[PDB]
Amino acid sequence: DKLNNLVLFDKATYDKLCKEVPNYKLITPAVVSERLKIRGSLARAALQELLSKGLIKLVSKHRAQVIYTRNT
Amino acid sequence: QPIKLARVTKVLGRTGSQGQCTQVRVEFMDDTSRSIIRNVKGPVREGDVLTLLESEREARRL
Amino acid sequence: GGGHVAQIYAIRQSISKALVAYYQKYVDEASKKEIKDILIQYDRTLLVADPRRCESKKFGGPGARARYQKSY
Amino acid sequence: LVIPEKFQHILRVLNTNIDGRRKIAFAITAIKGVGRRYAHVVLRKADIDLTKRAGELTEDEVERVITIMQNPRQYKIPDWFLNRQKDVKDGKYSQVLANGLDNKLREDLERLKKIRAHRGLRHFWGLRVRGQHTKTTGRRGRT
Amino acid sequence: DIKLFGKWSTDDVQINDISLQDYIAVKEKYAKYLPHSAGRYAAKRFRKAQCPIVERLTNSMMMHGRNNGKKLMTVRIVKHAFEIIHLLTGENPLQVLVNAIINSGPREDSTRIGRAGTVRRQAVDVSPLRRVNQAIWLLCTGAREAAFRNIKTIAECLADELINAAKGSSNSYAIKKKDELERVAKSNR
RNA sequence: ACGAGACUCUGGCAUGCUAACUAGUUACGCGACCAACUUCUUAGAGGGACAAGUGGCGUUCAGCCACCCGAGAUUGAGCAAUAACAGGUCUGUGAUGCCCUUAGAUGUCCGGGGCUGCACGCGCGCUACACUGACUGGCUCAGCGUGUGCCUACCCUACGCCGGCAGGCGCGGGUAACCCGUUGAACCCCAUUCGUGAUGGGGAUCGGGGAUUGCAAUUAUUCCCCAUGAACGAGGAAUUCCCAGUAAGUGCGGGUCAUAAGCUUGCGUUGAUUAAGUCCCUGCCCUUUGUACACACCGCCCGU
């Protein structure tokens, strides 16, 4: 009974849900997985792409909850 | 329903067909100190402080 | 030695005890009591390990206290 | 970390018709000869990693696995990876496909019934053929 | 430089009263940086009462037969993503952190009457520890079932666990179950 | 005067003691600037704990409760009072009292049917519910113990034929803290993982690769893999065991033996929800009481 979410990557729809994570007070893979009801691995990939963009620093790794933070 | 601090003076014992309640006597410290008895449950150690949220609950003995 | 609770917390037992012996045999007893008191007043469980050990398989049962099922 | 592949509401591999609800690449129970250590070995031999995004995995890797299983005897790779090996009627391990065919051949019960043996009836009644004890324990098999 | 943890301290948290340390008691060797102090809480009664409620909270998830007692589990749970939340909050979670659970607590449980009759229960109480931690035990079951066959899992409930830990106000769920039972059995006064 | 206690064995503790060429090591030490009077393991003449200190309950007695201190504050077992029972054993014993069958001696001889059925007539047994269950093989793990001629012909095991390892054959060591072995096809963990539970998560049979080599094994000996999908997540009436290193999970070793275990006897390893109570059920004991019972309530006993 898994829900149906829009996962297709489009010229328009792709750039409408990727800029909605930082619009929340509590922004963690746990909060996103319990509230927005999409895989937490997608949120982990999103924060990995943010780390690739160079605005944060990776500290440690885990299969569920990873550590990515900043000191600036 | 006031909150009163009382000290256990003596532990009487248990009751029930198989034993499921505990009896202690608690005395008030700031309410014109007098001796009131009340049944109790769980670890209520030797002369600890039992909190009375009410001054009317008694222990029906035997 | 294998076992986390064994060699861990034994590293702290060793640091406390080596400090104690060093200060006692080298400088004085007063500095020993001060710093040792700090270390072993942070926690007690250093100087004392659990005396608990596996106990003998007893009489007519699978283990120490469990007994084989009785029929009538 | 992006891929231009499009989500496919209908996907077809081996003409099976089963309820597609969960993820893929280890729910390949519909595929008969891939998975676990052998598939891991093949994928590691192909020199691929796990730097992509899970959830959306296509089926090309397992297609390549079956392609290599089409000619598995050329490279002398350890040959205890097929299901029915050293069977009569051939000295090799040929190809078969489609469901409704494999589950029967998991029990090749024609010659062992033809020989007038207790083995045919031991296998046929759904009972033991090696002797699993069936009076107090050992009651599973029909419920 | 005797500051508790690496972040807290014992020099600014004062109540100017020495009668209300029944929930948080950090004044002696019992203060713990990380709760993995080993020990046996079933050796004698009044010893699981002597537990620090943080340790009882985290350990009392030792239920099922396969996840029972394993202290590596609880220490990993309370370390993982707690290390994250400390640097991710910055502000004080103290408000909710105290203000849901640690005075959600009930005020009375019940006991059996006479020698027979399973239709009502005589209302009693305990000095708050046993009743609060019985609510905590039913909350262990409740938070489990909020994870057990559910969506929010273990090793990620750190907010709610700090709530279940700290100090004094009312928002809980299994505790209001206990309060429904409270009123029902309290109709016998 | 016995029994109880004491006692014996066993665990738990030493900046102490007695010393080890099988554990353990210091600046005229190399194979490396580009023969420490003995302590971790082993085991001995000793020490240590006494309700001893404090507080509170107790004709201020015996003692009880709690608390420091402490390695440890009712701490595993063994042994265990006359009378008892027609309890079991004559199939453990030229241990042992005679009424008394048969030749088809309850002797031999890899010899030889069953019992290894399935409408169950019963009893002891073989088994864990999710990021906890198991794989990355990416860090030094445990035992408790066993191991080769009076009999006797039967011991425990360290490389290669090589499919992917016990292993059909050559090979050495160990009568053992010397070898197996710092216990040679094992943690429970984990970059094969479950996003909310029939999937990857724990196996309904049942087939191949070379089988340890036991005439037989099937009418009891002998590996993991293809993922082939089994009410796939707290259980008629009745109930058995259990209070901290209980239970339960888990493997290992002894006995039986041909390395024959699903049995038992021990051993570690992970590790514990509940209870520090009661006499309600089943019983037991220290009293008083009743009895027409004494083969002792399964008694005795009344009625056409």
CA distances from E85 to A69, E33, E91, E92, E172 (A): 11, 16, 10, 11, 22
Does one domain contain both D4 and D71?
Answer: yes
Q: What is the CATH number of the domain that holds A49?
A: 1.10.10.10
Same domain, D134 and D88: yes
Bridge-partner residues for D50, per DSSP?
none
Chains A and D touch (3+ CB pairs under 8 A): yes
The reply to whether D97 and D36 lie within a common domain is: no
Q: How far apart are CA E40 and CA E38, in angstroms?
A: 7
Q: Which amino acid is at C21?
A: A
* E156 → closest Cβ in A30, A67, A69: A30
**Exposure letters E160-181 (e unless 16+ CB within 10 A, then b):** bbbbbbbeeeeebebbeebbeb
Domains in chain E: ranges and CATH = 4-187 (1.10.455.10)
Query: DSSP letter at B54?
Result: -
Closest to E111 measured CA to CA, from B45, B15, B13: B15
Query: Is D51 found in the same domain as D4?
Result: yes
Q: Are residues D9 and D37 in the same domain?
A: yes
Q: Quote the Cα angle for D129-D135-D136, to 5°.
A: 125
Q: Which helix (H) or strand (E) holds A67?
A: strand A67-69
Q: Are residues D74 and D15 in the same domain?
A: yes
For an interface test with E, give the residue of C42, C46, C47, C53 to mutate (most E CBs within 10 A): C42
Query: Which amino acid is residue E44, in one-letter code?
Result: K
Alpha-carbon span B4 to B28, nearest angstrom = 7
Q: Phi and psi of A60, rounded to 5°?
A: -140, 170
Which of D53, D44, D11, D45 has its CA nearest to residue D28? D11
Where among D28, D49, D78 does a domain terminate? D78
Contact yes or no for B45 and E49 at CB 8 A = yes
Give the method used.
cryo-EM
Cβ-proximal residues to D22 (8 Å cutoff; 6+ apart), any chain: A2
- Cα(E152)–Cα(E149) distance, integer angstroms: 9
CA distance B24 to B44: 9
Which of B13, B53, B14 lies closest to E108 in space, CA to CA? B53
Number of domains in chain A: 1
DSSP state of E147: T
- The closest nt to C3, taking CA to C1', is F141
| Angstrom distance (rounded) from CA E56 to CA E74 | 11
Residues D5 and D68 both lie in one domain: yes
Where in the sequence is the domain holding A52, given as residue range(s)? 3-72
How close are the terminal C-alpha atoms of chain C, in Å?
49
- What is the domain count for chain D? 2
> What's the CA–C1' distance between E42 and F279, in Å?
26
> What does the alpha-carbon distance between residue D10 and residue D20 come to, in Å, rounded to a whole number?
9
Q: How far apart are CA D92 and CA E35, in angstroms?
A: 62
Please, which residues bridge with residue E124 across strands?
Answer: E109
Strand F contacted by E156 CB (< 7 A):
yes
Q: What is the maximum span of chain A, computed from C-alpha positions, in angstroms?
A: 43
Q: Spell out the alpha helix ranges (H) of A1-72.
A: 29-35, 40-53
Given in angstroms, what resolution was this structure solved at? 2.7
Domain boundary among D78, D101, D130: D78
Which residues neighbour D121 within 8 Å (Cβ) at sequence distance 6 or greater? Answer: none
DSSP string of E155-187, one letter each residue: TS-HHHHHHHHS------SHHHHHHHHHHHHHT
Out of D78, D97, D117, pick the residue that ends a domain: D78
Q: What are phi and psi of B8, to 5 degrees?
A: -70, 130
Return d(Cα E81, Cα D5) in angstroms, integer: 34
* Same-domain check for residues D85 and D73: no
Q: Are D25 and D53 in contact (CB under 8 A)?
A: no
Parallel, antiparallel or unpaired: strands A57-60 and A67-69: antiparallel
Look up the CATH number of the domain holding residue D35.
Answer: 1.10.8.50
Distances, alpha carbon E48 to alpha carbons A10, E53, E163, in Å: 58, 9, 21
Clarify whether residues D95 and D135 are in a common domain.
yes
Q: The tokens of D31 are what? A: 């595929």
Show the domain range for D138: 79-143
Q: Are B41 and E122 in contact (CB under 8 A)?
A: no
